């Protein structure tokens, strides 16, 4: 009877949450209207983790939708398999963040904080456990970044003992994307350092190349990309919902993957992944899945792990198998590629097993790793930050909305010293 609220923020957070609330809706067997129509009580057992029940067959999802774009909110509420949302938890502004962390944090942020936190607590006594919060947003965005990190800060100071899954999507480090990408990225990760238990980061460029190289299907588009996003959603917290063998919930993943409280940023991966014309030519077995997880193409945070090491990693195998093969392959990875790992943590590769396979797959695997490869992303974000900050470009927006250079410089100092801990614990020997 453990509880996860999934309260989304921003345009990117709203899109990935709509994909979440449809990919688990057909997983647990719920139509777009809301009535259950599945064919197994394995779905029916732990619906309560995500869905607040109502009269009839209504299973409306417990989700504080936070946004500032009425068009985005309308598209989310009018999308297929997504009109199940209750009218109560539809808090959204009309001014909009306008791609600004400070505008989404202070002007449009703090006034919305009261109503949003009211909806959060209204869904918080309407449960039994409140095992964790799940905030999904984007680094570099306007609405999801400032309002989101303010929501981590407030929920962390008001319930200071529960897991906060920050499931954030970073944009591509190249081209330009948003003009204040390093500013919002630095500020958001600065709040995520000392207020979040655990954080997943997804890169859009890596989503592009994993949907283009292995998945093919000509252009990658966006729907398949967000389908892997929702697959990582439904794969990380599947021991909490579906029963099976050896289990690992959010707290167990946090304690097995966070050695030090600052270093809790993870790299996800979903690795059943084959194209249309190569699915009959590929035998699917746990060694094949393990090869696909540890293959660096499936990393969706960019950050090629061969330019670094692995502090810890966890694999959630979701589908019935033999754990002899899982143990064999998880040991063999360490034993042969022991140089690209850490020698001061014995057996840093972890496993969890759930029995129920996902929709249309014999077995699946979610691969999430705390590694040193993301220090490259953090240091290049800091480099772009100082490059666009030494000329004080777009400082006037943040100072008008209520920020200052002291906040900017302490955020980048926090980013730099987090890079320092990654480099130090990469170079640290056993004794």
């Amino acid at each position: 009877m453990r509880e996860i609220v999934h309260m989304q923020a921003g345009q990117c957070g709203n899109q990935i949450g709509a994909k979440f609330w449809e990919v688990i809706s057909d997983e647990h067997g719920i139509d777009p209207t809301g009535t259950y129509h599945g064919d197994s009580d394995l779905q029916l057992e732990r619906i309560n983790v995500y869905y607040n029940e109502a009269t009839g067959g209504k299973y409306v999802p417990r989700a504080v939708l936070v946004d500032l774009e009425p068009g985005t909110m309308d598209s989310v509420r009018s999308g297929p398999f997504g009109q199940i949302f209750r009218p109560d938890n539809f808090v959204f502004g009309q001014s909009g963040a306008g791609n600004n962390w400070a505008k989404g944090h202070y002007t449009e942020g703090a006034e919305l904080v009261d109503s949003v936190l009211d909806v959060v607590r209204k869904e918080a006594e309407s449960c039994d456990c409140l095992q964790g919060f799940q905030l999904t947003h984007s680094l570099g965005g306007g609405t999801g970044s400032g309002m989101g990190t303010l929501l981590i800060s407030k929920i962390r100071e008001e319930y200071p003992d529960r897991i906060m899954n920050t499931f954030s999507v970073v944009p591509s480090p190249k081209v330009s994307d948003t003009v204040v990408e390093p500013y919002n990225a630095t500020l958001s990760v600065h709040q995520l350092v000392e207020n979040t238990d655990e954080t997943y980061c997804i890169d859009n460029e890596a989503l592009y190349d994993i949907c283009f190289r292995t998945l093919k299907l000509t252009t990658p588009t966006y729907g398949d990309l967000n389908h892997l996003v929702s697959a990582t959603m439904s794969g990380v917290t599947t021991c909490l919902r579906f029963p099976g063998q050896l289990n690992a919930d959010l707290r167990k993943l946090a304690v097995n993957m966070v050695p030090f409280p600052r270093l809790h940023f993870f790299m996800p991966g979903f690795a059943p992944l084959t194209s249309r014309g190569s699915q009959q030519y590929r035998a699917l077995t746990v060694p094949e899945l393990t090869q696909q997880m540890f293959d660096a193409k499936n990393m969706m945070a960019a950050c090629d792990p061969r330019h670094g090491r692995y502090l810890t990693v966890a694999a959630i195998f979701r589908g019935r198998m033999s754990m002899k093969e899982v143990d064999e392959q998880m040991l063999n990875v360490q034993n042969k590629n022991s140089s690209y790992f850490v020698e001061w943590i014995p057996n840093n590769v972890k496993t969890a097993v759930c029995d129920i396979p996902p929709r249309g797959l014999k077995m699946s695997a979610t691969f999430i790793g705390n590694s040193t490869a993301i220090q490259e992303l953090f240091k290049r974000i800091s480099e772009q930050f100082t490059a666009m900050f030494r000329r004080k470009a777009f400082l006037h927006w943040y100072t008008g909305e209520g920020m200052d250079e002291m906040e900017f410089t302490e955020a980048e100092s926090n980013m730099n010293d987090l890079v320092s801990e990654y480099q130090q614990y990469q170079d640290a020997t056993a004794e």
Binding site: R276, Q279, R359, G360
Partner: peptide, 8 residues
């Protein structure tokens, strides 16, 4: 196989 045929 049924899910595969539904996919294609």
């Amino acid at each position: 196989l049924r899910a595969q045929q539904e996919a294609m």
